[PDB]
């Protein structure tokens, strides 16, 4: 089966240059091209280019032209995109997507996984973690992870084995520039005085792990 | 030049029942050879986008039957006939006849259910996180549906605008329910010049706006 691979994930500055790449496994012949696609977070697909790579000609969107350049290595089968001068507006997933053609319209249309992209001026840093702590039928507890950079940041419950009714809620940017983010639990009220609840929050670019058991507290 | 617009914007489907997803170009999408080569993609949450459909109605390969494109000119419509679990996501229609290309802004179908209010749950900073400065008040709003729902803040009955944060899960597996998490940042400083703080929620399922509160240091 013909597949895409894209290079990791990148966590830049403001004013540096990136170059992302995408490589064609599995399939010989030339007649493909290769098309990046923008996607910001929450949002919908943009075209920004495609490349011809037989002969390199290339079409970009009039919204990228002069922000980003296409190139190719037929010798390796593998596509770039490059920005010379990057922008926090740059953070995005960007995904290569390969058209098999047979002049002709018609082609078959093989994604890539998607590369997400970080443009910041923040630095890493691990996170705070802090107990919800329940209060006074169902309860609701959970930890809110504060104050981390890059993204991720990976949480679970007693050690996995707290599965069921876990809401980890998506990450958002604070004004910091750092990411804060909450997981919650709801459980029995009875199992508050029986049992103990300890979220376990990852941060692997800071090699930070954090174990904090939420109490109810007074 | 070619302008796709796509609509609606979200389709709550019943599962089994069907979903039409339409897309319209500002102009004629017939090619001059007299072909129409309008695309279709599907992307799962978290997924890359994959496509279902080329040249307006034929199937790429693997795509089962109940996905049938249709339209002709300006006018197209994507159809699925038996919506099911495995087909939540958002779905493109992709405009590559005329330079330049560009997708339809996207249909997001979630899974039709019956209303169900929001349980509301507020959480007062926990002391470690004052220790460092900065307190956040966090307002869950678990298991809901539909997405739609408002989230006010007050502090000594006076209203906040600015200084929240909000935060969505995706359309749940099991339940096919939502949750929101606000958060409400403030200064250690503020925090303790002001005694009662209060989360106010607005939802379909609610008959009046519920209000969840605390007082800084019960």
């Known amino acids: 089966e013909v597949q895409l691979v894209q290079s990791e994930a990148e966590v830049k500055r403001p004013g540096e240059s990136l170059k992302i790449s995408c490589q064609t496994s599995?399939?010989?012949?030339?007649?493909?091209?290769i098309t990046w696609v923008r996607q910001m977070p929450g949002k919908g697909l943009e075209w920004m280019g495609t490349?011809?790579?037989?002969?390199?000609?290339?079409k970009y969107s009039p919204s990228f032209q002069g922000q980003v350049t296409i190139s190719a290595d037929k010798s390796i089968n593998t596509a770039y995109l490059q920005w010379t001068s990057l922008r926090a507006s740059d953070s995005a997933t960007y995904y290569c997507?390969?058209?098999?053609?047979?002049?002709?319209?018609?082609?078959?249309?093989?994604w890539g996984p998607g590369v997400l992209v970080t443009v910041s001026s923040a630095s890493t840093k691990g996170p705070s973690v802090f107990p919800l702590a329940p209060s006074s039928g169902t309860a609701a507890l959970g930890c809110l992870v504060k104050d981390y950079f890059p993204e991720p940041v990976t949480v679970s419950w007693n050690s996995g084995a707290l599965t069921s009714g876990v809401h980890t809620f998506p990450a958002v940017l604070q004004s910091s520039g750092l990411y804060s983010l909450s997981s919650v639990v709801t459980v029995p009220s009875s199992s508050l005085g029986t049992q103990t609840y300890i979220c376990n929050v990852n941060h692997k670019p800071s090699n930070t792990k954090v174990d904090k058991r939420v109490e109810p507290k007074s | 030049d070619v302008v796709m617009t796509q609509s609606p914007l979200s389709l709550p489907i019943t599962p089994g029942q069907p979903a039409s997803i339409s897309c319209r170009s500002s102009?004629?999408?017939?090619?001059?050879?007299?072909?129409?080569?309008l695309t279709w993609y599907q992307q799962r949450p978290g997924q890359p986008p994959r496509r279902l459909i080329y040249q307006v109605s034929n199937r790429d390969s693997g795509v089962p039957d109940r996905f049938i494109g249709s339209g002709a000119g300006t006018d197209f419509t994507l159809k699925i006939s038996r919506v099911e679990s495995e087909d939540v996501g958002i779905y493109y229609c992709?405009?590559?006849?005329?330079?330049?290309?560009?997708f339809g802004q996207g249909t997001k179908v979630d899974i039709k259910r019956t209303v169900a209010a929001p349980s509301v749950f507020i959480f007062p900073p926990s002391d470690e996180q004052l220790k460092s400065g900065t307190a956040s008040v966090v307002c869950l709003l678990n298991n809901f549906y539909p997405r739609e729902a408002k989230v006010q803040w007050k502090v000594d009955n006076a209203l906040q605008s600015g200084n929240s944060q909000e935060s969505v899960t995706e359309q749940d597996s099991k339940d096919s329910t939502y949750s929101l998490s606000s958060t409400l940042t403030l200064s250690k400083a503020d925090y303790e010049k002001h005694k009662v703080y209060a989360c106010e929620v607005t939802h379909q399922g609610l008959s009046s706006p519920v209000t969840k509160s605390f007082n800084r240091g019960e």
């Open positions: 997507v390969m058209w098999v053609y047979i002049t002709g319209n018609i082609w078959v249309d093989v």
């Open positions: 490349i011809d790579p037989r002969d390199s000609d290339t």
């Open positions: 599995g399939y010989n012949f030339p007649n493909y091209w």
């Open positions: 992709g405009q590559i006849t005329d330079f330049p290309y560009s």
């Open positions: 102009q004629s999408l017939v090619h001059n050879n007299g072909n129409t080569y």
